[PDB]
Amino acid sequence: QIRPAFCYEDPPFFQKCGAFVDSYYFNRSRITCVHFFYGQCDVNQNHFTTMSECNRVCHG
Amino acid sequence: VVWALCFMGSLALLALVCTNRIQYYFLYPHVTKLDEVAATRLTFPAVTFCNLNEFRFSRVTKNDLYHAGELLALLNNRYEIPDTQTADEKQLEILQDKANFRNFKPKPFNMLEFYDRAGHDIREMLLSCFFRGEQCSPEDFKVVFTRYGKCYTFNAGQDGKPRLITMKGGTGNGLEIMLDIQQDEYLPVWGETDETSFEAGIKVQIHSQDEPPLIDQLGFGVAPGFQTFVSCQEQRLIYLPPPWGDCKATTGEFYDTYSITACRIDCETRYLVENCNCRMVHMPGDAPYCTPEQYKECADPALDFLVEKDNEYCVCEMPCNVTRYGKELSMVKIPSKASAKYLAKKYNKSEQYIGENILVLDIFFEALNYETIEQKKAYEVAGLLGDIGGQMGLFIGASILTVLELFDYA
Amino acid sequence: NLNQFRLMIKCTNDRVWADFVDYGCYCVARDSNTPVDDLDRCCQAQKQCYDEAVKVHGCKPLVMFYSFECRYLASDLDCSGNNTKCRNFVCNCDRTATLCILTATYNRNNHKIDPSRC
Ligand SMILES: *[C@@H]1O[C@H](CO)[C@@H](O)[C@H](O)[C@H]1NC(C)=O
Ligand SMILES: *[C@@H]1O[C@H](CO)[C@@H](O)[C@H](O)[C@H]1NC(C)=O
Ligand SMILES: [Cl-]
Ligand code: NA
Ligand code: NA
Ligand code: NA
DSSP states (O other): SSSSGGGGSOOOTTSSSSSOOEEEEEEETTTEEEEEOSOOOOOOOOOOSSHHHHHHHOOO | OHHHHHHHHHHHHHHHHHHHHHHTTOOOOOOEEEEEEOOOOOOEEEEEESSSSSSOGGOOOOHHHHHHHTEEETTTTTOOOTTOOOHHHHHHHHHHHHHHHHHOOOOOOOOHHHHHSSSHHHHHHHEEEEEEEEEOOOGGGEEEEEETTTEEETTTTOOOOOEEEEEESGGGGSSSEEOOOOGGOOOOOSSOOTTSOOOEEEEEEEOOTSSOOOOOHEEEEEEEEEEEEEEEEEEEEEETTTTTTOBBOOOOOOBBBOHHHHHHHHHHHHHHHHSSSSBTSSSSSSOOOOOOHHHHHHIIIHHHHHHHHSSSOOOOOSSEEEEEEEEEEEEEEEHHHHHHHHHHHHHTHHHHHHHHHHEEEEEEEOOOOOOOEEEESSSOOHHOOEEEEEEEETOOOOOOOHHHHHOOOO | HHHHHHHHHHHTTOGGGTTTBBBBTTTTTOOOOSSEEEEEEEEHHHHHHHHHIIIIIOOOTOHHHHOOOSSGGGGOBBTTTTSHHHHHHHHHHHHHHHHHHHHOOOOSBBBSSOOOGG
């Protein structure tokens, strides 16, 4: 329970529901956050505008 | 009066249309456009090939066997020839002597050096090579290390050498190589490891010079005892970057241009360094090279896991530029009965040897035409304005003139 | 190997890896006779677990790779994806130890002690 349950969800890779923008998600295999292009499909909360925030909320 | 009622109600409906059109622009949509492009030339691709056998038997020394014998299943964990060995008479005698480590002092050992030295030599494999009627030679092939070991790339276009071109469809305008896969040099197979296989032949990958090979994953095979024809079609796929699409242009981690294969090799390298504290000898970077014990215990399993099982560690962003080669393969037999003695005598081998070891490979294009599949921006600024002004005319009757009138009036 | 243990710890714990390295008598995977506290007792059972892996199953717990899955709940940390007895066994050793670490209290005064104590 050290990090929120949504940290373990796959971000919506390649899904376009609008503009693609720089984003960061927690990668549960690397156990750290990783850049990706977010297309506004708000399927879950595993996406952050900054690397640091992602690593704050989810890294642990 | 009621006119003003109808004018503003009509204008309200015009407003909701313009909001639709404007919100749609900010989706940055795209459509995909197909095109057949006629061409006077094509850049011939790079062609990477590997022997399926990684180490030449006659090049394995007592020291090699000491360090790498267990990895290659030639030795058990007691550094001895296993009783579950399945060898002939003569090879066994050679290996039994080679495995005699009584009063032997081990010397330093390195897998990259072992691959470079014991791996098959293009100078012996390449019996002949022609490209567009011109004779080529071992110097036209660049050494590249892959999971197969010491492999070779024709037309790599690296080190300041220019890329070659084709100008007509058909076999005469491509590559033809004759190879000896050298089965008498194949390492005896006594067990199952990642470094050995049950198969004889080569693995081949045809790819853009801008992308490294991933030949264990993405190659095709070619068998001894055949001439194999590979008829190719070039296909160029173009994707849009953000905000329209999600393609990646460059990267500044181990390679110049970005490609899926570059991404995968970066990931694989990071993964091995992270989990094993070492890199396999074909991977880029600075980490120390895995010892044979590390290959067996940590590196092979970790790479296998990543390449087969893992679903999350590496997820690669699509590149903006992809060149794909569609391929149609077919085969005829070599040697004919009528030509076997000629080949045996010309290469000083028996006729049976020729039949088990020689292959010919032809790689050429069906036609110069390449297909392009491209994402295009679907609704740019121009399309937005001309649309809004076209709706203004529909709802009110407003013009470019009408506007500059009432804008000067107020 | 200890890279996977370190990762299991990051998976469940914000406590930097350095704080477990050279803590007490046993951390991490070192030998002694008497553990300084309960945290150090975790590593002791881990070392004892590795020792068992080597002697009974022929594993090389400090060299071998294994895989594991990080989940929302620490207790849901999963070892079942491994394809051999050795990889399963050792993965389980590290899993047990990482969970035990959660129960124990992190002292700062038995981290990097003098060999006098152990
Ligand atoms: C990328 O695509 C453009 C056309 O969209 C092309 O001119 C260029 O050569 C491509 N880049 C590579 C490396 O092939
Ligand atoms: C070919 O036959 C064997 C092959 O090793 C060798 O002893 C012999 O010298 C060779 N002869 C010629 C003419 O190449
Ligand atoms: Cl991969
Ligand atoms: Na539309
Ligand atoms: Na194999
Ligand atoms: Na993991």
